[PDB]
Amino acid sequence: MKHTVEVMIPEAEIKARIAELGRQITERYKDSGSDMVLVGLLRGSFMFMADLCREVQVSHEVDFMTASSRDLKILKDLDEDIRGKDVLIVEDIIDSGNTLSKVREILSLREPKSLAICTLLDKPSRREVNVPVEFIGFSIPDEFVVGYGIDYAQRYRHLPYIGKVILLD
Amino acid sequence: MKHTVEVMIPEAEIKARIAELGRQITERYKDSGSDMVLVGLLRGSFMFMADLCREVQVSHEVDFMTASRDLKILKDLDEDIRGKDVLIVEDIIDSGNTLSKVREILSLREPKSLAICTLLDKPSRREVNVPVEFIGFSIPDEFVVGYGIDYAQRYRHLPYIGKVILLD
Amino acid sequence: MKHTVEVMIPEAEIKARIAELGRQITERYKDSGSDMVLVGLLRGSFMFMADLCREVQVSHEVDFMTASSRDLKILKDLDEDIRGKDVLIVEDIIDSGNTLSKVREILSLREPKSLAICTLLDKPSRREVNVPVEFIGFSIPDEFVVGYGIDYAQRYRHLPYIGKVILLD
Amino acid sequence: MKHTVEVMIPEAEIKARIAELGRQITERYKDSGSDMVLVGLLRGSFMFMADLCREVQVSHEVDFMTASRDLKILKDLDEDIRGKDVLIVEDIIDSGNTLSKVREILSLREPKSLAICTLLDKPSRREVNVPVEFIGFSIPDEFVVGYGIDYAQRYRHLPYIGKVILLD
Ligand SMILES: [Mg+2]
Ligand SMILES: [Mg+2]
Ligand SMILES: [Mg+2]
Ligand SMILES: [Mg+2]
């Protein structure tokens, strides 16, 4: 404990990058002709979700589910049916990617038209499970990050920018 | 709605048959040496579970989970099943779609083994080929209630399998 | 760890006592004329529930819900509506009775015709919250008990009798 | 089903108004000295939540829970609210029955304080007198979509409040 939080990725940059992802995702699914649904993973992705779905220019539905994070359980499942639909799993950050990996499996069992993942942050150096991530906002080093849905000691989860925690001696 | 309920499978037969299944399951897992866990599907299997686990002579844990076109997990397991022998316990299997998917979901967790044990089985109503390792009774497609199976929120607590008789 | 389990309350005695409770509960609600529902608290009461409902001679519905056991949360709620109905909360054992206490409050908010609790075992000496328990199978001293839904180290939960754990030196 | 959607409350107005609510809520709790937590009700409030919490200038935690004649808890809080200031965050309040009960349930947990903040309010549709401490917009009983509010699984992601126009 005993620390400080400084801006790592300012709000404007995050907003800009999200607008971009928005375009990319739209370009990618605009001609599918099938129902689409963005699936966020609570709690972490509520903010990134809120902002990302507004940038996606294709009629979709927004849903959430929460998984345990040694077995991976479903604490809260989807309300929507994804069978035959294009599904985009939306996450705040991917590091080890175990949980994500299993959630993807579980969902595919429901036979969606397609399955992809879009994360705001990516820590490639911390991967433990090879998992296909189709959209990334920022590839970052293994930094102690907070904000945009990411918390630390039940704090900072509501910050509008990605911050770096500095552990004072 | 206007109906009657008559005994189809009396309580004694059910108890006897369960004692048997009990032996079968015990014989089958007694030498595994791995942790075991019976997983019941709520609400339907609470009674069959309660009785079946008492007949299983191997140290196991008892857990439940409840499932919902897409098949969802309304309540998940509390236990981890990875590397453990898992026996899904159900009151009755007919179409077997839900069961089928629940089995898939669980296998993703990599248990040592996966099996299903149902009290009742209506083979004539299957829609999904699903492996059922233990069966108490194979029955015709009858309107059944009791032992966890209800009808209009009734009979779920009957100690025997009953047949519903619609009245015209 | 390192222990033994010996019979404290044999299966026959438990069966007999439950048949009795069965009669008592029936006598008590037989003339209500309102829908009835026994609500069990998972995991512990699945066995006591299974046996008790078979002794209750009044048409009822059986349901479950699971609560966290410092705030008391609802991990799994009822499927049935209890408003205007006679509700009997069914538990394997009551000791401190905090959780039970709160679950009772939560449910009353739904305005059931009536609310009662029926427990197999009762450890009066361990109460921390004064809570009304209308039916009791056995009042026991604060013994290390297992069986009939009560476990210890994920074991014995399936025993058909109440056992006493003996911690070998 | 055959319809159109036109802008009722443009995105800019909503952002502005939220910044204001932000100030109000901050002014109100800045000196509490107790832990604070905004509790959103899924699905509807995920967007309003996301934007509102960024305007609240006091260290808080963000949590959600989802509720269902009887009002049930489909998903409960992860946080404990006892002794903490709790702000229930909703997209819109009309009849307010569900909200009303959720408030009761939570108070049973003895939080330091309990308040509600809704983006939209349809006073004309109230059925249960429930205290709403913060409101973004008081609107007539219009067919609204956007900002978390959907219609036929659509528009939930619109950045503005829209009005649905049925076509005959
Ligand atoms: Mg995440
Ligand atoms: Mg079943
Ligand atoms: Mg209990
Ligand atoms: Mg709402």
Is C14 in the B-facing interface, judged by CB distances under 8 Å?
no
Angle (CA) D109-B73-A101 rounded to 5° is: 105
Interface of D with C in 71-100 (CB under 8 A): 71-74, 76-77, 79-82
**Quick one: which of A124, A89, A125, A93 has its CA closest to A108?**
A89
User: Is it true that the peptide bond before C127 is cis, omega within 30 degrees of 0?
Assistant: no
SS3 D48: helix
SS3 B73: strand
**Quick one: which of D85, D131, D133 has its CA closest to D112?**
D85
Rounded Cα gap, residues C21 and A37, in angstroms: 52
SS3 C46: helix
Residue list for the binding site of D for Mg(2+): 90-91
**Quick one: which of C90, D32, C42, D132 has its CA closest to B78?**
C42
Q: Which residue has the tokens 């400080």?
A: A4
Comparing CB atoms, the residue among D70, D77, D82 nearest residue C110 is D70
Position D164, amino acid: V
Asked how this structure was determined, the answer is X-ray
CATH code reported for the domain at A1-169: 3.40.50.2020
Task: Could you please state the CATH topology (level 3) that the domain comprising D1-168 is classified under.
Answer: Rossmann fold (3.40.50)
Whether the Cβ atoms of residue B53 and residue B60 lie closer than 8 Å to each other: yes
Chain A nearest CA to B59, separation (Å)? 21
How do D144-145 and D161-166 pair as beta strands? Answer: antiparallel
Which chain B residue has its CA at the smallest distance from C37's CA? Answer: B153
Which chain D residue has its CA at the smallest distance from C78's CA? Answer: D72
Residues from chain A that touch D79, judged by Cβ atoms under 8 A, are: 154
Size of interface A-B (CB pairs under 8 A): 36
Q: How far is CA B151 from the centre of its chain?
A: 17
Q: Quick one: which H or E segment has residue C34? A: none
**Quick one: which of A124, A148, A127 has its CA closest to A136?**
A124
* b/e per residue A86-105 (b: at least 16 CB within 10 A): bbbbbbbbbbebebbbbbbb
CA atoms within 13 A on the CB side of D39: 28
Rounded Cα gap, residues C96 and C127, in angstroms: 4
- Positive or negative, the Cα torsion across B57, B60, B61, B62? negative
* b/e per residue A4-38 (b: at least 16 CB within 10 A): ebeebbeeeebeeebeebbeebeebbeeeeebbbb
**Quick one: which of C164, C96, C94, C168 has its CA closest to C128?**
C96
**Quick one: which of D65, D49, D48 has its CA closest to D102?**
D65
Residues counted in chain C: 169
**DSSP string across A32-62:** --S-EEEEEETTTTHHHHHHHHHH--S-EEE
Sheet holding D144-145, edge to edge: D3-9, D161-166, D144-145
Residues from chain B that touch C151, judged by Cβ atoms under 8 A, are: 61
Q: Which residue has the tokens 């006591």?
A: C48
How far the first Cα of chain C sits from its last, in Å, is 9
SS3 A167: strand
Q: Which candidate in C4, C46, C86 is best for mutational testing of the B interface (most B CBs within 10 A)? A: C46
SS3 A17: helix
SS3 B147: coil
Cα(D135) to centroid of ligand 1, in Å? 30
Q: Quick one: which H or E segment has residue D126? A: none
SS3 C140: coil
CA atoms within 13 A on the CB side of B154: 13
Residues 6+ apart with CB under 8 A from A165: A3, A4, A5, A144, A145, A146, A152
Q: Which ligand is nearest to the CA of A117?
A: 1
Is residue A81 part of an annotated ligand binding site? Answer: no
Residues counted in chain D: 168
Cβ-in-10-Å burial (0-12, 13-18, 19+) of D129 comes to: exposed
Whether the Cβ atoms of residue B160 and residue B146 lie closer than 8 Å to each other: yes
Q: Quick one: which H or E segment has residue B92? A: strand B85-93
Whether the Cβ atoms of residue C97 and residue C128 lie closer than 8 Å to each other: yes
**Quick one: which of A89, C69, A101, A76 has its CA closest to D63?**
A76
Q: Which two tokens stand for residue C141?
A: 């001293």
Comparing CB atoms, the residue among D70, D72, D108 nearest residue C102 is D108
Asked if C95 is an active-site residue, the reply is: yes
SS3 D88: strand
Whether the Cβ atoms of residue A33 and residue A85 lie closer than 8 Å to each other: no
CA atoms within 13 A on the CB side of A85: 22
Comparing CB atoms, the residue among C71, C77, C80 nearest residue D73 is C77
| SS3 of A54-117 | HHCCCCEEEEEEEECCCCCCEEECCCCCCECCEEEEEEEEECCCHHHHHHHHHHHCCCECEEEE
Q: Quick one: which H or E segment has residue D164? A: strand D161-166
Rounded Cα gap, residues B117 and B91, in angstroms: 9
Cβ distance A50 to D53 less than 8 Å, yes or no, reads no
SS3 C6: strand
Cα(D24) to centroid of ligand 4, in Å? 21
Whether the Cβ atoms of residue C120 and residue C8 lie closer than 8 Å to each other: no
Helix B46-55 × helix B11-29 angle, to 10°: 60
Whether the Cβ atoms of residue C117 and residue C137 lie closer than 8 Å to each other: no
User: Is it true that the peptide bond before B43 is cis, omega within 30 degrees of 0?
Assistant: yes
Which chain C residue has its CA at the smallest distance from D100's CA? Answer: C109
Sheet holding C60-67, edge to edge: C74-76, C60-67, C36-41, C86-94, C114-122, C135-139
**Quick one: which of C55, C62, C58 has its CA closest to C23?**
C55
Longest CA pairwise span in chain C (Å):
56
Residues from chain B that touch C46, judged by Cβ atoms under 8 A, are: 40, 46, 49-50, 62, 64
Rounded Cα gap, residues C112 and D131, in angstroms: 25
Q: How far is CA D126 from the centre of its chain?
A: 15
Which CA distances in Å does B16 have to B12, B23, C113, D92? Answer: 6, 11, 39, 57
Rounded Cα gap, residues B166 and B43, in angstroms: 24
Q: Which two tokens stand for residue A112?
A: 């969606």
Is residue A157 part of an annotated ligand binding site? Answer: yes
Comparing CB atoms, the residue among C70, C83, C106 nearest residue D80 is C70
Whether the Cβ atoms of residue A167 and residue A5 lie closer than 8 Å to each other: no
Position B68, amino acid: S
Q: Which two tokens stand for residue B113?
A: 């083994």
Position C42, amino acid: L
Interface of C with B in 19-38 (CB under 8 A): 35, 38
Domain ranges of chain C: 1-169
Rounded Cα gap, residues B3 and B1, in angstroms: 6
Radius of gyration of chain B (CA): 16
Cα(D152) to centroid of ligand 4, in Å? 16
Cβ-in-10-Å burial (0-12, 13-18, 19+) of D142 comes to: middle
Whether the Cβ atoms of residue C102 and residue C72 lie closer than 8 Å to each other: yes
Q: Which two tokens stand for residue D57?
A: 């200038």
